[model samples]
Target chain A: VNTATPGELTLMLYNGCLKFIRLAAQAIENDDMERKNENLIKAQNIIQELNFTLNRNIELSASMGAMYDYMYRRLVQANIKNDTGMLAEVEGYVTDFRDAWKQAIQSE
Target chain B: ATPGELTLMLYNGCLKFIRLAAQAIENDDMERKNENLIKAQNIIQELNFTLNRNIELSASMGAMYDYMYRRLVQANIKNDTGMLAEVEGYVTDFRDAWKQAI
Candidate 1:
């Protein structure tokens, strides 16, 4: 990631985050606590990583920041409450975000 | 979800955001960290703004929310997850109480 452009780095993080969130969601299905926690943390970290890249000077970033903010803790709450429903809620958000960001990268 | 349920959802929403904001500090992502904290603060402010002062319970709820919002702000200022967790403690308890009432 050191040599990657900012766009490329975030492109990767979005995929990375989606990958981990999906894995965590699967871990719940498989009845694996450790796997679920590990993967959720990974997904959550990537979400954190992406937050730094949000363009804060505009209104879009505020909403995105708010949504990302929703996601990061929703991941924890999903774990805390042992609710896969919450995980799915966040999965949708992360997936959509990755798509939006990927579009940003492509257009640029 | 009723208006009350909506409030509960907001409570859950804010806690989740603040917690992540605190978590971000450890990874040295202060900008993103601030973003999340700011999100949490806005939610809290939004909730507070909607309070019905004519209601008797508003005073106490207002106090509790004031405290919760302050802790999250301080958490962001200090880059302290502990403060965030503490805010979470209060927010969770408040959410539960609201749930019970609704």
Candidate 2:
């Protein structure tokens, strides 16, 4: 059992990213392009912060680190192109991560 | 089958289109918006199709997908700005939907 708060921090970071992604999507629908961009940037910044924090403190499994790296790249692409298609693609990737975690927890 | 995976994928896809639509709006790019909307619609359709294929998984994911689908349409109808509350509502609805299944 990982009893440290960092574990929660990681989970929270993931959750926060998801929340911002949703909010950004809402901004898009509103045609509030400004807000949409702002939200995307906010999400990108959060992801960066998470990455930096993890690098500084956590000893992540190689796969976990790779997952975060991939997510960051995907976020950047989504922001640059304003491409929701990419976001959906990235979501599929994260879903795999979430499923892996779920399986791990279940087995435990 | 983990329902969470399906839900997250759908949620992610929604986020992608949201950004795409927002950019289109920003640039007065109706064409882009329309294109993104089509993409969003297709993703929803895919999710629905997936749901139908795996009834056991769909039983839980299907309801969540329905709520997200409704919210996505609502956002498009309102032009994105009006659906904040609805989007948030759907988020919670999704969480609750899955909780009920778990």
Candidate 3:
């Protein structure tokens, strides 16, 4: 498990964010506002970290950073607005990222 | 799994979530209902986002994914099993076609 490459680590982060987002949505449905807030914050923190860790020296990294920044903002919006649609959008991007990462890992 | 096989997994997973959500509605389990619907919606959203719009087939599939996503949201909000049934039909069709192709 500790032998994961950077790509695999990033894939785990993406997957963790997805899990938190889904849990946040579940909390919303259960009328547990506190749990919803907690889960969303966890997801936001993951996206924030992803954005912060980007190697902006690379052109593609800069673009990916911007996407992460956008996703972080949307998570905030979803938290404030209690909007699952925003969550859906961010989750979509995260899933795509996760899948792409998996593809790269396998292709190597 | 290979890429095509992974895509098949997503389709099958989506169908499973939709069915679970429908069952949750029948059981008067609102929490389970919302959870499964959210899971299904996430899958559909992913499927839509990853589509290669450069192709005509992807364009049409994207439309169906959008429609299915909307119906799932409606089902989640309105607790309408009918909407789940409708979306399930589309997913089944897609999954079967994909299964054959793969």
Candidate 4:
């Protein structure tokens, strides 16, 4: 929360999303319904955050929102289906996004 | 060193292994990945074991550490670097929190 730069904030959100997804995965594995719901919603909130924060005027806004939208849907499906595969699918996307942002931040 | 600081050091070590494991996967080095992933899992297990679970907060943390450990195991078993990334996220977050507190 202390971070100010957009790139840093985005990277943190990515990391936070991944963290919750992992926790959700464990909760599913252990049959912990309460934890699974809690973690899944946290992941979903991060996805929405990423989408809502996308600058509407930017060229990448629409395209990035599409990706985030896809992830948000997948996250919801992951919760309903009780499926880690869906979580893994979203993880792959977020990892790529995070890595790209990290490289960009490193260069600037 | 204070226990809190030592815990921070352990957190750092765990993240180091997670990075190594992730890189090892990228390099197509299964052996290296296995070694490093196991090291990370051991650190999580240690953290979980030493937790003062009588306290509510410590108990919550213990649960999280257990989840992380299980995820590391899944990563190693499935060759899923995504799982590694997931655990890396948590470790990095916890490390930052611990660092600021100590």
Candidate 5:
């Protein structure tokens, strides 16, 4: 596997998270609870991976890490509640994620 | 490179229209404004056409292109500065949106 630079790895994790969210939404819509849980677990795992990766970047903010934690909590809540609406709410956070990275990359 | 190149080209086209539209507004040149508007419309239409031509875009990306096109047209009609900025924002978003997909 090609080892990614920090920036590229960040983007990969972001995209992977988005893919998981999209799949989770679809799975929920299709009433596939098992699939939805699986996707959510993958999403949580990616967020954890991101957390570990970002931990070494001194330039990163506590608020940014908090955002990821918040998203992870939201995803978990959505799964526990079986609330697709909550999932949609959690999806709104992706825009925040996107904007945050755009700011980060531009400043870099 | 494929989708990014195409989107960058389209983003440039949108930027050109933004300039032309700004000029028209500055001069209060209604005719020129309409002309520039037509040019903008055509550029957007060409983007749509390009997307349609590319089979890959038909599924999700084409819908995204269509959304941007409609937003551009709405901006034109409203003479919205915010929407102009929105086009700029979308250009960046488009860049980021497809970066990983490509």
Candidate 6:
């Protein structure tokens, strides 16, 4: 939000996914399939959007894409299974990416 | 289940669980991964019980099921998705044969 750059925006979208997963988990606890699926789908869409903006021409970008690929594919399993544990695992990955991004931004 | 239904279920069940375990491997769900592979091995054991070792085909089928069962254990221990892919090919071949036979 501060600079309106791709990097900043990428971090925001990652946070967006984190937010959706937490909401989706709560929905599962509440027995709300509608809410569960909605938030989970939102998180997936955010992942797709992040994937779309990636610059895969670079080597680092390709590795990032591979990670996202696993993350996206895992989300489908997690969603279909209503698996909060799997969601938490994916959340852990994105958090690592987010924290790394944060460090990268702070360094410059 | 009749003889036909039983064999078919064994084949289908083995094929299904391996496929699920394959996905769980990629999804990074250790619990699901273990559960599916365990189920696959369990199905193979049950399938093996149906084999008639007196018949040449049944003896070999029993052998093949044992191999698959052992490989599934390694797959669980190693977290090896490639192992499951290889196992699936064997499962499908046996499945097709069972479908034709029964």
Name the candidate that leads on lDDT. Answer: 4
User: Candidate 4's residue-wise lDDT over B29-90, tens digit each?
Assistant: 76766665555445544433223111323335545655665665565445455775677677
Cα error, candidate 2, residue B79 (Å) = 61
Worst 10 residues of 2 chain B by lDDT: B49-58
Model 5: residue A35 alpha-carbon error in angstroms: 0.6
Relative to the unseen true structure, what is the C-alpha lDDT of residue A108 in candidate 1, on a scale of 0 to 100? 36
Model 3 residue pairs with clashes: none
Candidate 4 residue A81 Cα shift, in angstroms, is 60
- Interface root-mean-square deviation, each candidate: 21.4, 19.7, 20.5, 22.1, 24.3, 26.8
Whose lDDT is higher: candidate 1's or candidate 3's? 3
The runs of at least 3 residues in candidate 6 whose Cα sits more than 4 Å from the true structure, single-residue gaps closed, are: A1-6, A55-108, B1-102
lDDT of 5 by residue, B1-102 (tens): 111232334335544543565566557665655554444444434333333223332335434444544554454445444543554454456448546443
Expressed as tens digits, the lDDT of each residue in A1-108 for candidate 4 is: 112222233356557767777776777677676776676566655544333222111323345545655655654454444454654565566566545444433443
Tens digit per residue, CA lDDT, model 5, A1-108:
122121343345456655655565566667676766675555555544333223222234444445445544554454344444644554455444435444543443
Strongest candidate by DockQ: 2
RMSD to native, candidate 4 = 22.1
Q: Write down the worst ten-residue block by lDDT for model 6 chain B.
A: B47-56
Which of the two candidates, 1 or 4, achieves a greater TM-score against the reference? 4
Which docking band does candidate 4 fall into? incorrect
- The C-alpha stretches of model 4 lying farther than 4 A from their native spots are A1-6, A55-108, B1-102
| Structure candidate 4, residue pairs in collision | none
Candidate 2 per-residue C-alpha lDDT over A50-79 given as tens digits, one digit per residue, 9 for 90 to 100: 323322222223444455455546655555
Q: Which pairs of residues have clashing backbones in candidate 6? A: none
Q: Which stretches of candidate 3 lie over 4 Å from their true place?
A: A1-108, B52-102
